[PDB]
Design a protein around this ligand. Structure first.
Ligand code: 9SL
Ligand code: CAC
Ligand code: CAC
Ligand code: CAC
Length: 818
């Protein structure tokens, strides 16, 4: 097997061939393909001439589009997970330097930093926090009483909980995004470290601002503007100056600067629709070196010879952060835009930093004087990912064998950023959007000029299969411009489309709502399913007696008078299926919050929960159908498991188990002769009962009171800015095509000939506008009992790539005392 790495320059080719000769990965052969620039390597990968390369984050979005169509696959984790056992990696890397007397970080058995660190060759010791950051002032020489280093095993929120406001924390001890004051009614949002965001203070009785989840990144890199102390201009006087940039497509040399110039209104630019960003920048600076730029004056200062001048390549001596520094040093520019990785103390004598507040500060003040944070780059390959396995196996084996991937005598930041500690395989789900995150993806999209201009009068409805797409096309065809259709492969894909600005609304079952609410989407309308009362549909806003929701109940046989909610442990159970809300989510959530987290084996006896491990206690009661009893078909999440679903779990209770976990309708749907099957033909609803949380039992008609939990209705989600419009247009369309629509003979919102339950559940009576209450949206939508039961009333109850991409990563301020 081969992995063709694409190099952009002679120096990168030399490092790549050094790795070819020195790094022995069995069964995988490294091959180096040479191109003249970053973009020519991207093209070679697109064409199948190379396999992988490393890209700046500022390039990921552009790389994901024509004419490249590349995706991130392998990268260093840009989150607080970069610090999980980081001591071990820094220890391996320091020992890899093979320098005599060099300081080697000391870790414990778990891989964490020892609170006291020592430089063995000098006898000096100091204290570090759990992140490996030096506590200020704790360095002592040998022979002197040492500073006492504290373990500080509790997080900041849990340590503030020791003090007696009341900062609600999650289970890991981190701050909750939403903070609510108990004495008053004011609620606000915090920033992972426990500091309030401006604009989130909401008085009681007002709709609270939805808080985004935050994650603290320890070691951050920043885009800075470096100048000489000999000059005297300020940031507001940049127009007409000569500049050196690391690269036209890099965040540390272009995109952060462009963002700041637009925000400060220093750059005359009418937007990407009227003028390219490069065109506007070429009239802002007079003669610059900006590798890759297509404006000639932005290449005049570059030093490369014929054919190499202004190339995105180390063949251009002014390319990259150190090349832009060389350009500034050799006086070919008045300012250099570069990443803070190229700052050093040796440069603090001659050079300083130009800050966007029109001041100048020392180099050590880069956290206080920068143009934004720079996320880590990433290895990319073709979207079709035919070589991802090979690239990953090669890189992981090379890291395990400690090959010199992240350093070279030929130069700095060749092939990879030298600051890379460890590369890890990304999930195949990760694309440019998930890698950059919501805000950054949108900013890159807007800078490129692909930003969708919103329409207040049209709703782009997202579909999850071809039949939904056909039904939506019908709807759009009779909608008079009010409805358009987009296509995705699953509800999460639609949620992503909405977050990216490619769609506007989608219906989501409860399973998907947590994620959706985590990412800042809100319910516009909800499916109303009460078939006995059309009032709230005919007269929108009229009072509601029952929304038609399903209630999750624990059904028993009345004869077995020994089953109570307290002695459920050990009894035989019946479930509709793993993942189902009434059949699985709510029962197991209640059990785990009342006993120890142990549903597999350590609670029930023999059960039949389809989809579980075939050789487990939760699969003994399951029986397949004798139509093909040769195959197992036991615990199959399908019709072949006779105990799968509502009728399945009821049959399980009938023939095997003691208690069934089902929606309240199952016993009524299957008893009283309403089921023509052989079983339940003589079954009565009065022959069963339901278990209550207080240990009591109640008749099957008491499901509204004696229930395990309520279940929220399916919700149509959209972005906040679209709520009104969506609520309006749906309403209009309902009055046309709902169950009593004026033109119901032309189209039906809640039925179709193309299939069943497309876009909405066919049993939907209508869609009712969500009435937002002055509370947290998680509680407001789920109901406080459901929220508290299945998510602990916490924003940290689930992890996913989407939730990560919706999590804001941010950096500290300056000092590291404690
Ligand atoms: N009729 C009814 O059942 O309420 C419908 C609507 N839908 C929810 N999922 N909710 C969560 C709890 C809740 O109060 O029932 C509600 N919260 C608001 N703001 N309106 C409700
Ligand atoms: C806690 As000690 C004496 O190993 O620094
Ligand atoms: C053994 As010592 C004085 O370097 O902690
Ligand atoms: C400025 As480019 C997308 O050709 O690297």
């Amino acid at each position: 097997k081969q992995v063709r790495w694409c190099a952009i320059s002679d120096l990168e080719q030399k490092k790549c061939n050094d790795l070819v000769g020195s790094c022995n990965v069995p069964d995988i052969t490294l091959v180096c393909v040479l191109r003249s620039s970053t973009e020519d390597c991207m093209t070679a990968i697109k064409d199948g001439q190379a396999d992988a390369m490393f890209l700046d984050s500022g390039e990921v979005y552009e790389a994901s589009k024509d004419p490249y169509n590349l995706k991130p696959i392998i990268a260093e984790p840009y989150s607080s997970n970069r610090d999980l056992q980081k001591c071990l990696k820094e220890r391996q890397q320091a020992l890899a330097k093979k320098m005599i007397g060099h300081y080697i970080p000391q870790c414990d058995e778990k891989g964490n930093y020892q609170p006291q660190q020592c430089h063995g060759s000098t006898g000096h010791c100091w204290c570090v926090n759990a992140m490996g950051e030096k506590i200020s002032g704790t360095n002592t020489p040998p022979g002197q009483t040492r500073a006492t280093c504290e373990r500080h095993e509790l997080p900041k929120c849990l340590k503030e909980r020791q003090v007696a406001f009341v900062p609600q924390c999650d289970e890991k001890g981190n701050y909750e995004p939403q903070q609510f004051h108990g004495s008053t009614g004011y609620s606000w949002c915090v920033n992972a470290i426990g500091e309030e965001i401006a604009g989130t203070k909401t008085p009681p009785g007002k709709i609270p601002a939805t808080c985004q989840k935050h994650d603290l990144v320890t070691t951050c890199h920043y885009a800075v503007a470096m100048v000489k102390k000999s000059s005297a201009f300020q940031f507001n006087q940049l127009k007409g100056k000569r500049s050196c940039h690391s690269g036209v497509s890099k965040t540390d040399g272009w995109k952060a600067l462009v963002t700041v110039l637009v925000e400060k209104k220093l750059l005359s630019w009418d937007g990407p629709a009227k003028e390219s960003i490069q065109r506007a920048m070429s009239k802002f600076f007079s003669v610059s070196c900006i590798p890759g730029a297509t404006q000639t004056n932005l290449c005049k200062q570059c030093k490369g010879e014929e054919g190499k001048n202004c190339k995105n390549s180390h063949d251009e001596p002014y390319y990259g952060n150190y090349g832009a520094f060389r350009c500034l040093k050799e006086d070919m520019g008045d300012v250099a835009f570069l990443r803070s990785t190229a700052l050093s103390d040796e440069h603090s004598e001659v050079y300083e930093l130009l800050c966007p507040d029109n001041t100048r500060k020392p180099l050590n003040k880069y956290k206080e004087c920068n143009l934004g944070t720079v996320p880590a780059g990433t290895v990319v390959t073709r979207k079709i990912s035919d070589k991802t396995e090979d690239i990953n196996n090669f890189l992981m084996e090379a890291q395990k064998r400690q090959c010199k991937l992240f350093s070279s005598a030929h130069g700095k930041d060749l092939m990879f950023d030298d600051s890379t500690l460890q590369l890890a395989l990304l999930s195949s789900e990760v694309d440019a959007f998930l890698y950059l995150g919501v805000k950054l993806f949108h900013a890159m999209k807007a800078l490129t000029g692909d930003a969708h201009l919103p329409s207040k009068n049209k709703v782009r409805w997202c579909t999850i299969n071809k039949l939904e797409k056909m039904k939506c096309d019908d709807w759009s065809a009779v909608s008079g411009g009010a409805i358009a259709c987009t296509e995705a492969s699953c509800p999460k894909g639609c949620v992503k489309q909405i977050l990216k600005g490619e769609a506007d609304a989608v219906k989501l079952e409860v399973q998907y709502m947590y994620e959706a609410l985590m990412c800042g989407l809100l319910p516009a309308v909800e499916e109303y399913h009460n078939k006995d009362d059309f009032g709230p549909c005919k007269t929108p806003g009229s009072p509601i007696t029952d929304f038609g929701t399903l209630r999750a109940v624990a059904l028993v046989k009345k004869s077995n008078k020994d089953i109570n909610w307290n002695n459920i442990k050990g009894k035989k159970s019946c479930h509709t299926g793993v993942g189902d809300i009434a059949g699985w989510v709510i029962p197991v959530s209640l059990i785990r919050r009342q006993n120890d987290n142990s549903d597999i084996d350590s609670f029930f006896g023999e059960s039949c929960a389809p989809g579980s491990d075939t050789k487990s206690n939760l699969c003994k009661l399951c029986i397949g159908d004798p139509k093909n009893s040769a195959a197992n078909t036991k615990c199959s999440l399908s019709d072949k498991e006779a105990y799968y679903g509502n009728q399945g779990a009821f049959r399980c209770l009938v023939e095997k188990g003691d208690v069934a976990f089902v929606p309240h309708t199952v016993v009524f749907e299957n008893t009283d002769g309403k089921n023509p099957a052989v079983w339940a033909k003589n079954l009565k609803s009065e022959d069963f009962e339901l278990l209550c949380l207080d240990g009591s039992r109640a008749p099957v008609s008491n499901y509204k009171s004696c229930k395990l939990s309520g279940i929220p209705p399916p919700a149509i989600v959209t972005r906040e800015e679209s709520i009104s419009d969506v609520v309006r247009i749906v309403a209009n369309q309902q009055s046309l095509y709902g169950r009593k629509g004026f033109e119901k003979d032309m189209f039906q919102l809640f039925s179709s000939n193309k299939g069943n339950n497309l876009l909405f559940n066919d049993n939907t009576q209508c869609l009712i506008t969500f009435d937002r209450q002055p509370k947290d949206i998680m509680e407001d939508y789920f109901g406080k009992p459901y929220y508290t039961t299945v998510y602990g009333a916490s924003r940290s109850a689930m992890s996913s790539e989407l939730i990560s991409a919706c999590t804001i990563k941010h950096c500290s301020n300056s000092l590291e005392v404690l």
